């Protein structure tokens, strides 16, 4: 629909402008939100930012973190929605959609182009990146503090340089931002360095009952709600585990089933060089991404949603290694 | 002392041996092949090897069979890359008191065994320096001599993570993948190739790791029976010290490693201020000031553990 150059035409155009991400944030998100807030305020514009969402605990020390907010009092002229591929993603927000007209930049090829303007270019690895050309295009001189918060999403979006998105211009842009001041060890602990004591004790549990199944090629854990209980931990200490168990040798998915509160069992899938878990996620009635999914049992005994699942994935999958 | 020199002496000699580290990481074996490969283009007979096996994650890397255990060889010139002391090129270091040797390093312990040594501690893995010289020697890069060149800036900054990640080594990282270095290809092999009995040895290590200085040292130890019960090696606890030092508040995480039997290894790893090397170096061993580590040989490993944490908390202390 639209190109950078008629972004950056609009952001000129226009004041007060409310800067607004998709809810359940991560690094990509923050990053887009900050970075093009900073920039827009310093050419003077009256901005706010907003994720309908609790921003997680790993950002607490970042700079400006505070501007991100939960319930913004603002009557903006023009709405930005970042990193956000369809409207209910920015949660209440989207009301704002028939009332404020509205800019959209993003890196998602399932992006619907609900904005009056659209840059939607996926080959990009990070809206974060996207956002790093939108600033200098307005002449945003950046600081150290400014290239940090840029240099978080394309970090995290490309799994810390090691997704099959990390290319010459993702390493470029690493590059560019770590020679403004962009502080990586700085990024890097507090994303992935920040984990509680106790989810190591919770780690083991699972890692003493992981199993594999189907040549090695199916890996799967659960977290009974009991077992949250014993480590004082909670769903929060657990989300990177499904992840983790994907990094085994020849596996090409790995589940994990998490029950917390009681009686609520989330399941994560993972799947690493062919499978689609969406599909599979989809038709337990969840859903997701081709290499990442999920679906939520709610009221049920996780001794029984574990057969429930793998029956199911165990079908999919061996039709899958057919044709 | 300086790279210059190191190219003349490269330049002097046609038959060369380039040796690496036992225990290899990836900034050895990226080292070795890096620097191996680009000799080779200046036309010279060179071999490469490491006293010691090689581990699986890097047997799909291109001309990994280039390094060998038992080089039928007889080198004018011995390089060694990324070794800080003799005894850390294992039988290798017979060859110092009859070949003339290069030493290309940057840790700063090491020990200036070769004739000639370039040892820059700023550099966050040696593998930058091999980029360097090869670039001084006029090497042209194809893809998979910038896979195996990124491999070493990868490993030893932890994959962009650690400390030393300065924009050196972004540089470096960007002009490596623009020659075709497969950044993802080297990620998938090192990160994603985790046998699944190592999983279970790690859930004994998580089992055992312990707290001190009130949350801000955390510690764990593998004796020989438990790699044995779990079919592990030292490769399968190659990456265990720096997941615990992502424990939020540690600053040093400390492995004990027993393998083989009556070697007793202690890796260490700080986060924001803590020189981990001083700690080795004062116990026989180096490193960097963020990792370090030492080996000890025929001791207990039951009076190891509390002499090496005694000595480490009096030196977080005096820190
Ligand atoms: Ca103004
Ligand atoms: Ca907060
Ligand atoms: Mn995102
Ligand atoms: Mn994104
Ligand atoms: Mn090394
Ligand atoms: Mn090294």
Redesign the interface.
Known sequence: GSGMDEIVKVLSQHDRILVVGHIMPDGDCVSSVLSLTLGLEKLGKEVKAAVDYKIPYVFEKFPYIDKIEENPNFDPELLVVVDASSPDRIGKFQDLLDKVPSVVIDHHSTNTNFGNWNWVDPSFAATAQMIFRINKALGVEYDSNLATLNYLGI?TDT??????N???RV??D??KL??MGAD??FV??EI??????EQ??L??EV??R?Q?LEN?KI?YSYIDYDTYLRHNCTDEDSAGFVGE?????GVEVAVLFMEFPRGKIHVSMRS?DWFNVNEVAFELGGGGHPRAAGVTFEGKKIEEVIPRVINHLLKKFKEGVES
Not at 159 to 164: K, T
Not at 192 to 197: A, I, M, P, S, T
């Open positions: 970090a799994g810390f340089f090691r997704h099959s990390a290319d010459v390493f470029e690493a590059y770590v020679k990586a060890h890097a602990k992935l360095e920040n984990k509680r004591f190591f004790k780690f083991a890692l003493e992981l594999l090695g890996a168990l994907r990094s085994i040798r690493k």
